[PDB]
A paper describes a structure:
[name] ([name]) is a prototype member of metal-dependent/lithium-inhibited phosphomonoesterase protein family defined by a conserved three-dimensional core structure. Enzymes within this family function in distinct pathways including inositide signaling, gluconeogenesis, and sulfur assimilation. [name] catalyzes the metal-dependent hydrolysis of the phosphomonoester bond from the 1 position phosphate of Ins(1,4)P2 or Ins(1,3,4)P3 to yield inositol 4-phosphate and inositol 3,4-bisphosphate, respectively. Conserved secondary structural elements comprise juxtaposed metal binding pockets and define a shared sequence pattern of D54…E79E80…D153PID156S157T158…D317 as shown for [name].
We tested the effects of substrate addition by co-crystallization of [name] with a 10X molar excess of Ins(1,3,4)P3 substrate and 2 mM inhibitory Gd3+. Although we could not confidently model the substrate in the resultant structure, metal sites GD1 and GD3 became equivalently occupied. Difference Fourier analysis showed densities peaks of 20.5σ and 20.0σ in metal sites GD1 and GD3, respectively, giving a relative occupancy of 1.0. Consistent with the Fo-Fc differences, anomalous differences peaks of 15.4σ and 14.0σ were calculated, giving a relative occupancy 1.1. Co-crystallization with Gd3+ but in the presence of substrate (I(1,3,4)P3) resulted in equivalent occupancies of metal sites GD1 and GD3 consistent with the hypothesis that substrate binding alters affinity at metal site GD3 by contributing an additional coordinating ligand through phosphate oxygen. The observation occupancy at a second/third site is also consistent with previous kinetic studies which demonstrated metal binding in [name] is cooperative with a Hill co-efficient of 1.9 which predicts if metal site 1 is predominantly bound in the absence of substrate, that an additional two metals are bound cooperatively upon substrate binding. It is noteworthy that the addition of substrate resulted in a significant change in the ratio and intensity of electron density peaks such that metal sites equivalent occupancies of sites GD1 and GD3, each having a tremendous signal exceeding 20 sigma. Anomalous signals confirm this is because of metal binding. While we did not observe the Ins(1,3,4)P3 substrate, we hypothesize the sulfates and/or phosphates seen in the [name] structures represent the 1- and 4-PO4 positions that would be found with ordered substrate or reaction product.
Residue numbers in the entry: 1 to 31, 48 to 237, 262 to 273, 284 to 340, 349 to 358, 366 to 389
The structure:
Amino acid sequence: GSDILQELLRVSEKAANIARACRQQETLFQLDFKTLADVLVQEVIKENMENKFPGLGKKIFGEESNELTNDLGEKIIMRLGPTEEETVALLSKVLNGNKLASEALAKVVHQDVFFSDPALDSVEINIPQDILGIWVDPIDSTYQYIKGSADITPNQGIFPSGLQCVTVLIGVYDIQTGVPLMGVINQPFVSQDLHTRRWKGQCYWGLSYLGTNIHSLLPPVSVVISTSEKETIRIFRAAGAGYKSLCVILGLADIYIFSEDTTFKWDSCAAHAILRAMGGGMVDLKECLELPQLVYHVGNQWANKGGLIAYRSEKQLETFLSRL
Ligand SMILES: [Gd]
Ligand SMILES: [Gd]
Ligand SMILES: [Gd]
Ligand SMILES: [Gd]
């Protein structure tokens, strides 16, 4: 699934473009638009993968429905393309005939982006298409996205809030076993040029298939824990489900622990796969308080009931579990 992973990187950077535009571009910034933006990103990934790999389109699941409601109360089925003009005519039904906003989105949705890791072009791993399911969280950390803080100082490499906490989560899992095989995390807002206002992004991929474990090149640099801003259970507050998982991937945090039932398969799947590829993973917190990995094939519905612990090292985990 190296050719599938390489294609999931492209659409994630295409998703990042849509995430950046709706903050950067000023027509869209003024403007429920977030739910629209989520479905639009979710439908871009769904169709592009269907296009390049026929049969995967019906195996791509996500946080949002493909159906939205406008101010008139009409229910619209969000199907993009094939031409740019049809997407304008579809979005103008949802945004109350707002042509400036409809033309703006459609231009980014139909924008050919060429994002490729040459490291992944070298590797030739094949995974049967028939055993693959995909979980998608289009733009994670809704609150931090809409507020849009670009001026927050990180506490020891970890941003407590701000646009850095926003991530595009695309996970791929085995349908039969439920084990996450591949995962892509895209930070659309990492570094801003103060003068030009332009945001530079960063993507992270990982593969774990039948003992073959490869991941993206990670930048250099007792225990360092990262909890959510609402967590009421050296500890760090950090916003965004995806970002807190990325902190464990980047080594900024040793453990990410979430107690509540308000995380879902699409929040964790992408990170879990990348963590698996570095010899880590995610366990059920409640089952550990009585190593059971999170599954992504069976429901309960698609919430991680009993919380989760995200770990990079299995030794770091055992130490943390000994204290708790
Ligand atoms: Gd290939
Ligand atoms: Gd959403
Ligand atoms: Gd389609
Ligand atoms: Gd989320």
